[PDB]
Design an enzyme around this catalytic site. Structure first.
Site: not given
Lengths: 374, 43, 114, 64, 90
Positions: C37, C40
C-alpha cells in the site's frame, strides 16, 4: 446550465485510503518502508490501478477539464474543514457538502469484544462520512448533474445505503446517469454470494459500471479463471502466438458477462490496470490496449489514485461525447484518453498530488499512440 | 560517394530496360546505370 | 550500543489480543498496514514521529493485513491506512480513523479521548 | 486573383490551384520491391508530432 | 572427402536434404549473393529471381502459363531431387 456538464460524486471524502485490500504473497521488510516502493513497480494484481474515495474521482475529473460536485457529510472539526478546503482549492463544488458540528470527521466509535476466543469490533457510532441523511441531500446538484457516481463503500453503511438509493431515485428522475464504480472494500471480499446479494440492487440501478479484472472474476468465478490462466498445453500450442508465453489478456465473452448484465446497463468497463480496458455495451464489446511505465521513475512512482484517474477520464469523455455509447471506434478513441490519464497518475507519490491535467493527458495520449489511433 | 536526392514530390518515370539489375551492399534490389540515364519526376 | 531505527513494534493477532485483554495504563494505538500500500509509507513515518513524541505515554503497534487478514476483517477494517485508538479504560469505546489523518489529529485524539 | 497577388506579394498559394495536376497512380505495393512497400500497420516513431515553436503560434494568431 | 562425410552425416547425425520453401526475397538473396557484392547480375536464375521480387510480375507469368495461383502456391511444396523406386509389395 454551464459547460462542461456537471457530474456528482457521492460517498465519503477521505485522504488516500485505498479500499480494495486483499492478501499478497510477496511482502517486504515490515519496518524498512524504503523497500516498499518495489511493490509499487511489482504490485499485487488487485493493486495495479487502485481506486479510492469519490472525492479523488471528483478532483481528478475537475483537473481533466470537467465540472464536478461532491455530495457527502463531514464533521465540524478541523479535519472536516481541511478536507472541504482541499476539495475547494481543486474547484470541486462544495454546496452539496453537509456539516455536522457534533461529529468528529473520519472517526468511528467501536466496541471491542472477544466472541468465540477471537477479538472483534462492532460499530457504536458511525462517522459523519457514513451519516448523510436523505433530508440533507442537495436537490440542485442532483438536478444539474448528468452523471451520478458512487462506490460500493456506501453499501457497508445502512444510513448511506438508504441515502444513496434516495439520491439515485432523484437523479434518475432528472435524467442523470448512474455510474457504479465498485471498489470493493475489505469486508466485501469474504465470499462471492454475499457480495452479489449485497450489490445486486445498486448493480441493477446503474447505467455505467467500472470493475477491475479481479473484482469481475471474484463476482463470477475466481477458481475457474485462475485455472484457465494456469493451463498449459501438453504437447504443442494451438497457434504461434501461444508459444510466446505472453501475459494473459483474456477478453471475457458477453456470454460470461450475461449473469451481471441487465436492461439499463449502457456500458460496462473492466480494467486490467491501465494495460487493458475491456468494454461491453448492449450492441458490441471489445478491448482497448493500453500500457504502463512506472519503472521510468522508480523513485516517484505510486499507483494510488490511478483507477480514480481512469474513471474520471471515462466520465470526462462521456459527458462531452454522447456518441461513445453507440460508436465502437469513438468509444475506443475516447477510452485511450482515460488510459493516458491513468498512466500519468502512476508517476507521482500521492493520489491527489499526482492527478494529471487535460493538456498533459492529451499530450501523453498523442505521444504513446500512433496518429491513426487518436 | 554522393547521394542524389529527389528535388520534388512526384512520380518517377524511367525505362527499366536501359539499366542492369543488381543488389546493393545493404541487400536491396537496385538498378546499375552505365549510361546517361534520364529520369522524369512528374511533380 | 546501536539504537534501533524503528520504535513501532509489529504484533500478531494473538499478541494484540493479549495486549488488549491485559491491564493498560497508557493509550494503545493499533495500525493496520500493508507493504504493497502506497499511503502506508507516509503513515509509517507519521507513526514513527508520533512514537518519538509519546515516549512512554502511549503505545504504538502495527498489524500487517497480509498476515492477519481475517483478524483485520473481524475488527471492521474497510481499507488502509486504518488506525485504532484504544483507551486504557475498558468502559470506554475505541475510535477507528480511516485515511491519512494529520499528526495533530492523532495528538488531539490521544489527549482528549483516551 | 493569382498573377497579381503573386506580383504584389499579397498572400497567395505557392502553386496556382488552376495550374495544378495530380500525380497520377503510383505503385500499389503489388508491383513494388519489399524495401519500398508501405508497412501494413502504422509504426510508432517519436517524431509523429510536429515540434511546437514560436512561429506556429504567431502565424496562427496573425491568421486569426 | 565430400562423399563419405555426407554419408557419415546422414547415418550418424540424421542429416537429410529437406526442401526449403523460400519466399521470393530469400530466393533472390540466395541466387544473387552467389555472384558478388554489387555486380550486374548475369546468371539467368538471378535475373529471374530479381523479376519475381514483384508479385505483379509473378501474377503475369502465372497467367502466361495459363494456371491458377492456388496450385502454383501448392507447386512450391513439391519434393525435389530423385524419387525412390516404387514398392512391389509381394
Amino acid at each position: 446550465y454551464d459547460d462542461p456538464p456537471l457530474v456528482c460524486c457521492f460517498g465519503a471524502v477521505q485522504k488516500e485510503f485505498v479500499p480494495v485490500v486483499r492478501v499478497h504473497d510477496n511482502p517486504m521488510h515490515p519496518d524498512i518502508y524504503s523497500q516498499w516502493k518495489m511493490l509499487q513497480w511489482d504490485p499485487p494484481e488487485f493493486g495495479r490501478a487502485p481506486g479510492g474515495p469519490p472525492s479523488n474521482v471528483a478532483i481528478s475529473h475537475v483537473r481533466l477539464g470537467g465540472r464536478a460536485a461532491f455530495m457527502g457529510k463531514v464533521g465540524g472539526d478541523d479535519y472536516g474543514e481541511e478536507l472541504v478546503l482541499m476539495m475547494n482549492k481543486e474547484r470541486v463544488q462544495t454546496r452539496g457538502v453537509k456539516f455536522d458540528e457534533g461529529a468528529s470527521t473520519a472517526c468511528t466509535r467501536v466496541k471491542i469484544k472477544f466472541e468465540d476466543g477471537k477479538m472483534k469490533a462492532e460499530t457504536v457510532k458511525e462517522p459523519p462520512e457514513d451519516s448523510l441523511l436523505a433530508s440533507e441531500l442537495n436537490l440542485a446538484v442532483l438536478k444539474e448533474a448528468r452523471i451520478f457516481h458512487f462506490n460500493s463503500e456506501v453499501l457497508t453503511s445502512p444510513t448511506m445505503e438508504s441515502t444513496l438509493f434516495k439520491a439515485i431515485q432523484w437523479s434518475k428522475k432528472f435524467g442523470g446517469l448512474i455510474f457504479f464504480d465498485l471498489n470493493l472494500p475489505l469486508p466485501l471480499w469474504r465470499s462471492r454470494n454475499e457480495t452479489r446479494k449485497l450489490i445486486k440492487k445498486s448493480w441493477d440501478e446503474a447505467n455505467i459500471i467500472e470493475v477491475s479484472q479481479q473484482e469481475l472474476e471474484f463476482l463470477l468465478d475466481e477458481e475457474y479463471y485462475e485455472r484457465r490462466r494456469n493451463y498449459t498445453p501438453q504437447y504443442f500450442a494451438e497457434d504461434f502466438e501461444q508459444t510466446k508465453n505472453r501475459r494473459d489478456y483474456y477478453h471475457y465473452t458477453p456470454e460470461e458477462i450475461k449473469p451481471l448484465w441487465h436492461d439499463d446497463l449502457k456500458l460496462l468497463v473492466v480494467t486490467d490496470g491501465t494495460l487493458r480496458l475491456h468494454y461491453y455495451t448492449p450492441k458490441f464489446d471489445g478491448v482497448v490496449v493500453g500500457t504502463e511505465d512506472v519503472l521510468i521513475t522508480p523513485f516517484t512512482c505510486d499507483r494510488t489514485g490511478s483507477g480514480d484517474a481512469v474513471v474520471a477520464g471515462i466520465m470526462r469523455k462521456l459527458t462531452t461525447c454522447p456518441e461513445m455509447f453507440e460508436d465502437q471506434d469513438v468509444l475506443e478513441r475516447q477510452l485511450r484518453f482515460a488510459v493516458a490519464a491513468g498512466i500519468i497518475s502512476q508517476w507521482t507519490i500521492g493520489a491527489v498530488r499526482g492527478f494529471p491535467t487535460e493538456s498533459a493527458t492529451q499530450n501523453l495520449k498523442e505521444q504513446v499512440y500512433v496518429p491513426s489511433m487518436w | 560517394a554522393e547521394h542524389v536526392r529527389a528535388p520534388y514530390n512526384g512520380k518517377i518515370k524511367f525505362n527499366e530496360d536501359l539499366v542492369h539489375p543488381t543488389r546493393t551492399r545493404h541487400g536491396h534490389p537496385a538498378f546499375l546505370c552505365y549510361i546517361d540515364l534520364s529520369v522524369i519526376i512528374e511533380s | 550500543f546501536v539504537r534501533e531505527d524503528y520504535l513501532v513494534r509489529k504484533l500478531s493477532a494473538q499478541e494484540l489480543q493479549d495486549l488488549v485483554k491485559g491491564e493498560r495504563k497508557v493509550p494503545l494505538i493499533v495500525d493496520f498496514y500493508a507493504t504493497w500500500c502506497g499511503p502506508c509509507i507516509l503513515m509509517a513515518q507519521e507513526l514513527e514521529m508520533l512514537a518519538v513524541e509519546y515516549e512512554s505515554n502511549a503505545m504504538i503497534v502495527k498489524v500487517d493485513t497480509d498476515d492477519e487478514y481475517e483478524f483485520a476483517r473481524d475488527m471492521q477494517v474497510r481499507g488502509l491506512p486504518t488506525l485504532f485508538f484504544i483507551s486504557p479504560d475498558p468502559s470506554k469505546d475505541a475510535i477507528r480513523t480511516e485515511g491519512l489523518i494529520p499528526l495533530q489529529m492523532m495528538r488531539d485524539i490521544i489527549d482528549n479521548d483516551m | 486573383g493569382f498573377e497579381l497577388d503573386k506580383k504584389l506579394g499579397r498572400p497567395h498559394p505557392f502553386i496556382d490551384p488552376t495550374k495544378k495536376k495530380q500525380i497520377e497512380t503510383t505503385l500499389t505495393s503489388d508491383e513494388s520491391w519489399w524495401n519500398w512497400r508501405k508497412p501494413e500497420k502504422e509504426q510508432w516513431s517519436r517524431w509523429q508530432r510536429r515540434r511546437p515553436d514560436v512561429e506556429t503560434v504567431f502565424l496562427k494568431a496573425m491568421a486569426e | 572427402t565430400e562423399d563419405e562425410a555426407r554419408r557419415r552425416n546422414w547415418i550418424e547425425r540424421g542429416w537429410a536434404p529437406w526442401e526449403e520453401i523460400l519466399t521470393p526475397e530469400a530466393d533472390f538473396a540466395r541466387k544473387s549473393l552467389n555472384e558478388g557484392e554489387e555486380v550486374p547480375l548475369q546468371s539467368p536464375e538471378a535475373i529471374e529471381a530479381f523479376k519475381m521480387l514483384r508479385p505483379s510480375y509473378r501474377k503475369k507469368k502465372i497467367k502466361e502459363m495459363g494456371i491458377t495461383e492456388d496450385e502454383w502456391y501448392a507447386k512450391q511444396f513439391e519434393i525435389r531431387g530423385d524419387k525412390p523406386p516404387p514398392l512391389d509389395t509381394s
